[PDB]
Amino acid sequence: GIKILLHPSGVVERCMVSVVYNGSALNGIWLKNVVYCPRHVIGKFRGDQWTHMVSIADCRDFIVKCPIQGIQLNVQSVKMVGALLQLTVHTNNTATPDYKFERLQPGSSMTIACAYDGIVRHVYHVVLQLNNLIYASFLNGACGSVGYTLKGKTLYLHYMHHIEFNNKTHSGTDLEGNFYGPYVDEEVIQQQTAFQYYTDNVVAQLYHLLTVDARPKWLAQSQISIEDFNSWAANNSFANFPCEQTNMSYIMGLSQTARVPVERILNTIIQLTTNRDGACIMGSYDFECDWTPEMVYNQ
Amino acid sequence: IKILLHPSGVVERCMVSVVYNGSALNGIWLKNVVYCPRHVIGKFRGDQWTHMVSIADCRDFIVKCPIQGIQLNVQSVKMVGALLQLTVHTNNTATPDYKFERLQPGSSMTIACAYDGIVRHVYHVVLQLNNLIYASFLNGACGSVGYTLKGKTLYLHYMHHIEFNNKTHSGTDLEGNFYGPYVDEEVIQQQTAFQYYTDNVVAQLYAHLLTVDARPKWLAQSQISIEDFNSWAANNSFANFPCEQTNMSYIMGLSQTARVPVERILNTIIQLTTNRDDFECDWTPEMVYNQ
Numbered sequence: 001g002i003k004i005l006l007h008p009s010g011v012v013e014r015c016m017v018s019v020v021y022n023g024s025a026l027n028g029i030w031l032k033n034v035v036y037c038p039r040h041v042i043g044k045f046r047g048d049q050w051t052h053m054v055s056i057a058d059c060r061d062f063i064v065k066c067p068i069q070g071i072q073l074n075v076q077s078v079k080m081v082g083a084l085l086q087l088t089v090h091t092n093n094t095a096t097p098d099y100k101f102e103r104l105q106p107g108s109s110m111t112i113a114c115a116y117d118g119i120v121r122h123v124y125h126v127v128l129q130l131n132n133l134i135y136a137s138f139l140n141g142a143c144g145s146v147g148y149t150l151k152g153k154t155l156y157l158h159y160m161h162h163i164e165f166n167n168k169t170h171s172g173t174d175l176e177g178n179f180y181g182p183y184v185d186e187e188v189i190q191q192q193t194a195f196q197y198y199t200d201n202v203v204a205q206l207y208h209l210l211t212v213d214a215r216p217k218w219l220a221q222s223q224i225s226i227e228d229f230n231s232w233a234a235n236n237s238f239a240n241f242p243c244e245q246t247n248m249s250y251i252m253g254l255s256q257t258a259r260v261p262v263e264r265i266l267n268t269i270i271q272l273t274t275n276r277d278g279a280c281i282m283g284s285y286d287f288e289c290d291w292t293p294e295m296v297y298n299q
Numbered sequence: 300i301k302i303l304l305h306p307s308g309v310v311e312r313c314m315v316s317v318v319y320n321g322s323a324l325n326g327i328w329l330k331n332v333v334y335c336p337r338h339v340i341g342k343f344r345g346d347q348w349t350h351m352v353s354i355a356d357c358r359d360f361i362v363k364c365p366i367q368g369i370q371l372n373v374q375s376v377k378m379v380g381a382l383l384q385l386t387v388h389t390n391n392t393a394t395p396d397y398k399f400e401r402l403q404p405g406s407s408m409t410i411a412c413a414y415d416g417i418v419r420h421v422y423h424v425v426l427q428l429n430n431l432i433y434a435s436f437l438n439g440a441c442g443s444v445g446y447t448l449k450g451k452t453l454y455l456h457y458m459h460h461i462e463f464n465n466k467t468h469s470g471t472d473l474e475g476n477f478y479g480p481y482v483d484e485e486v487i488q489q490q491t492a493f494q495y496y497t498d499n500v501v502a503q504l505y506a507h508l509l510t511v512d513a514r515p516k517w518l519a520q521s522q523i524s525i526e527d528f529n530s531w532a533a534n535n536s537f538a539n540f541p542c543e544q545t546n547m548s549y550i551m552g553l554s555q556t557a558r559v560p561v562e563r564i565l566n567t568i569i570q571l572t573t574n575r576d577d578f579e580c581d582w583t584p585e586m587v588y589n590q
């Protein structure tokens with residue numbers, strides 16, 4: 001079958017820690033001898049107050065515990081890197097994997113290890129949207145939770161949570177400390193660019209054809225050219241196709257398996273915007289960007 | 300509101316590879332017992348299993364725990380249901396508090412799809428009323444487990460055995476008993492006709508109302524009573540509502556948040572019949588409401 005595949009969370013569970021500072025509690029990840037955590041654990045500061053407040057923060061006020069390894073950590077140094085804190089600790093984490101800090105592009109997926117008090121409670125799957133937000137699920141204390149992928153034995157850290165907006169959207173930084181999109185870790189009202197479907201992923205969602213119904217009734221009989229679709233997409237909140245040229249090899253492979261050219265899929269998308277009438281496609285009632293062409297093709 | 304899965308670390312530390320005379324699959328290592336599917340010893344049927352198990356030399360079960368870098372030695376072999384219980388000399392220090400809990404249809408679990416004793420993927424399934432799960436497995440994936448977590452207690456529900464022609468999958472609980480009338484034999488087996496788990500269909504529609512679009516246009520404008528729905532359900536492949544009385548509290552709470560009564564949802568289910576002329580029961584009302 002074709003499923004949403006999550007990367008196993010064990011390697012991340014053993015590096016998670018809890019970070020508590022003067023009544024404020026969240027999560028951090030412990031790699032080598034450094035704990036990375038959101039900087040707002042020491043207060044709800046604004047603009048350019050961060051550098052001074054971090055320079056004033058007492059290292060002994062950072063209470064860091066790694067619950068699975070059952071040991072307490074002692075912060076020797078604090079250094080702000082971007083919107084993250086780098087608390088250098090005395091002990092090296094023997095569970096540290098081979099890792100790399102890798103920034104995600106919009107339309108790519110990752111597994112979220114959503115933790116509380118340094119303990120992973122739930123894992124789930126998200127895709128970075130074109131507004132540079134993720135549609136995740138977080139409560140108080142969930143900040144510091146990470147989004148990641150795995151390739152062999154290497155852990156690819158992509159994301160660390162900071163903030164939730166009014167419409168239950170979520171924003172954070174990569175592990176080098178830079179936010180996705182223009183959002184910041186402040187309680188101010190921040191503008192959001194209008195939503196736009198990642199067209200490659202919606203196409204991968206319809207390619208349902210391979211697991212649910214090879215010939216559904218809502219699948220268009222006629223084709224539309226990529227170019228004619230892209231003129232329509234500009235006025236209907238769909239990104240220009242293809243969003244990534246590398247997805248074309250996956251999409252071409254899916255088209256041969258399903259025996260349905262992508263031009264029919266694209267024209268199905270156009271018709272569905274006025275014809276869907278509650279149709280359920282790959283188990284969802286709307287267009288979803290969670291299915292990437294790579295995951296659907298490779299599994 | 301997301302599909303929530305349970306973290307796989309505790310399961311990862313317990314997985315092992317079981318290889319027997321060229322047949323390779325997975326097992327789980329709890330205390331001093333490795334649990335694996337029995338067909339690793341060969342393709343037998345009916346009541347052949349008992350005798351064939353008792354002549355299998357324990358030295359032929361090559362058992363490795365790749366996470367801990369350990370190779371285990373089987374001391375004795377016991378068949379419990381359709382599972383082998385391989386007693387090993389070493390106790391697994393990573394063993395958690397665990398329970399063998401049987402799943403009822405309509406409940407969810409997390410699958411730790413493994414190969415060579417190493418978890419490769421983690422994905423979500425709901426046991427359907429035909430007692431099958433719609434999963435994804437390749438050769439050597441047998442012995443993969445389905446689980447949930449309540450704190451740090453590992454609840455084991457499923458161990459994988461067989462894949463049917465329509466990419467349904469069947470297996471046993473950890474006591475060794477299959478879900479439904481399916482067995483570990485390479486023959487055509489009749490299937491329970493599909494039936495929609497109505498509690499989950501209701502839960503998914505509420506999840507859509509509470510995230511994407513409250514009041515879409517295909518929403519039913521008028522109510523239908525629970526009783527009148529159940530008379531329709533009996534002739535239209537939908538289970539009697541509610542499927543679990545304990546789901547009513549979740550469903551009524553979701554109806555209040557979305558401000559749409561469940562009677563309207565049930566009537567929407569009916570009017571959507573033409574669209575159906577699958578994967579509609581993957582959201583349980585507990586997962587939707589709690590998060």
Ligand SMILES: *C(=N)[C@H](C[C@@H]1CCNC1=O)NC(=O)[C@@H]1[C@@H]2[C@H](CN1C(=O)[C@@H](NC(=O)C(F)(F)F)C(C)(C)C)C2(C)C
Pocket residue numbers: 025026040043044045138139140141142143144162163164165166170184185186187188189190
């Ligand atoms: C860190 N653990 C939390 C995670 C939040 C809590 C609710 N759901 C989540 O994902 N992050 C925060 O508490 C950050 C933190 C102060 C306020 N904040 C928010 O996420 C707030 N949002 C906003 O102010 C908004 F809307 F502008 F984005 C909150 C109202 C609590 C959701 C700071 C420093 C931004």
Ligand SMILES: *C(=N)[C@H](C[C@@H]1CCNC1=O)NC(=O)[C@@H]1[C@@H]2[C@H](CN1C(=O)[C@@H](NC(=O)C(F)(F)F)C(C)(C)C)C2(C)C
Pocket residue numbers: 323324338341342343436437438439440441442460461462463464468483484485486487
């Ligand atoms: C155990 N590792 C595999 C898991 C399979 C491999 C492909 N996808 C899976 O889920 N299970 C088996 O190899 C079992 C095993 C012999 C045959 N078998 C099957 O799953 C086969 N299916 C059937 O026999 C069917 F469809 F008729 F039910 C197979 C054709 C290989 C998929 C035994 C002893 C049943």
